[PDB]
């Protein structure tokens, strides 16, 4: 009977001089803290029990109390930053790192979990866990010929804790820590368990969310083809982080973007740009907008893969955030594209949805659309066809919108719109 103990009874048992009474009371605490309904974390903290639990972590001759106190401290560290800090302040970090080497797998796993919660608080505790030396023993647990010999839940918890050591910015994780973790991360990215794949992908997405040097560290390990394969997964919890990572990577240099293209990513975008999950569609369109900001041959590969009609589709009908990203993709396309590429854009039907979006309450999207329209008109000039385009815009009703924009609040807006009128509709 360790069920429904009072905190006072727990304190009584833990303050006894009897390791087995302490074990019973720690288990009672664990059971209080592992209920879903409002676990009494703060009451346990106020009772002063964290130091006792931390001391129990070191009791090698009573592994049950190591496990029970590890679980209790895990659940305390799962709370607010103040509660996690309470666990850190009691000395828990080195004690958990020492438990990583336990011969009992359920105890090492519980230490992995606790360290995941501590690191998940934020950059400072993440880096403090690293400074206390957690990475080496964590990776040692994964240094096996075949990850399949490990228990599924254990492997999942190891992957998740590793992902938290890769998470967060200001600052990003230490460069040497990333380099030390990456080979194991790449091995996890090839594992067959959906949750391991998802959390590995999330870690890779964290590591690519930064300057081009971080992106390059990742790309050099050769993960882009595997990311593209996972971009094609049926499980949405895998697609989402794989797509996040791909989008991050194409924020980099034209060469890193080209590595994404060469791996076959564009072939997946017909489905991504029509995906029923709004956030997938939005992130896919954001990624496209960064690809169309690249080189003219990269725009050409966007064309060859049949993706301009899919951008026309998103512009015609999508969540408004997705539509704004699509407008960005079009402006980048027209800013970097050849005359022929811009003409092709017009032939795909861009004008009417582009115009229909000008009645938006968002000023940024209006600016973006007007810039795109100007670039298209410049290509038309280069071809001597500006009247055709003006007639198109007028026939679908866009000229009325542009005229209405003459009396717009923002300076750039009415500057742009009256330039258009005086230059092409006079």
């Amino acid at each position: 009977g360790t069920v429904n103990w009072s905190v006072e009874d727990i304190v009584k048992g833990i303050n006894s001089n009897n390791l087995e009474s302490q074990l019973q009371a720690t288990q009672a605490a664990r059971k209080l803290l592992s209920r879903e309904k409002q676990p009494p974390i703060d009451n346990i903290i106020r009772a002063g029990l964290i130091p006792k639990f931390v001391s129990f972590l070191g009791k090698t001759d009573c592994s049950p109390i190591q496990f029970e106190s590890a679980w209790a401290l895990t659940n305390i560290a799962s709370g607010t930053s103040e509660q996690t800090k309470a666990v850190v302040d009691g000395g828990a970090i080195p004690a958990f790192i020492s438990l990583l080497a336990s011969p009992h797998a359920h105890i090492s796993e519980q230490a992995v979990w606790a360290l995941g919660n501590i690191a998940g608080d934020g950059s400072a505790f993440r880096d403090l866990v690293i400074k206390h030396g957690a990475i080496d023993p964590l990776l040692a647990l994964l240094a096996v010929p075949d990850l399949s010999t490990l228990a599924c839940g254990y492997l999942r918890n190891l992957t998740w804790t590793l992902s938290n050591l890769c998470r967060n910015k200001n600052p990003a994780p230490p460069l040497d820590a990333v380099e030390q973790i990456l080979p194991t991360l790449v091995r996890l990215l090839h594992h067959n368990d959906p949750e391991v794949l998802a959390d590995s992908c999330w870690a890779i997405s964290y590591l690519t969310d930064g300057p081009n040097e971080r992106i390059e560290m990742v790309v050099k390990k050769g993960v882009v083809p595997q990311l593209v394969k996972l971009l094609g997964a049926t499980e949405l919890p895998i697609v989402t982080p794989a797509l996040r990572a791909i989008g991050n990577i194409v924020t980099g240099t034209d060469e890193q973007t080209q590595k994404v293209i060469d791996a076959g990513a564009l072939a997946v975008f017909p489905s991504l740009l029509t995906n029923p999950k709004t956030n997938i569609q939005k992130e896919a369109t954001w990624t496209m907008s960064n690809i169309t900001a690249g080189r003219q041959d990269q725009i050409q590969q966007v064309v060859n893969h049949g993706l301009v009609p899919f951008l026309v589709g998103v512009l015609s009908k999508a969540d408004f955030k997705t539509q704004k990203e699509a407008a960005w993709a079009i402006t980048n396309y027209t800013s970097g594209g050849t005359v022929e590429q811009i003409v092709y854009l017009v032939h795909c039907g861009i004008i009417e949805p582009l115009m229909n979006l000008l009645s938006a309450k968002d000023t940024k999207i209006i600016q973006v659309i007007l810039d795109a329209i100007s670039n298209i008109f410049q290509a038309a000039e280069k071809l001597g066809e500006t009247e055709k385009l003006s007639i198109m815009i007028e026939e679908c009703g866009g000229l009325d919108k542009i005229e209405a924009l003459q009396r717009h609040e923002n300076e750039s807006v009415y500057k742009a719109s009256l330039n258009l009128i005086e230059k092409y509709f006079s």
Binding site: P39, T74, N75, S78, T84, N164
Partner: peptide
Amino acid sequence: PPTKKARV
């Protein structure tokens, strides 16, 4: 994924 999680 969550930043933290309790064991229930």
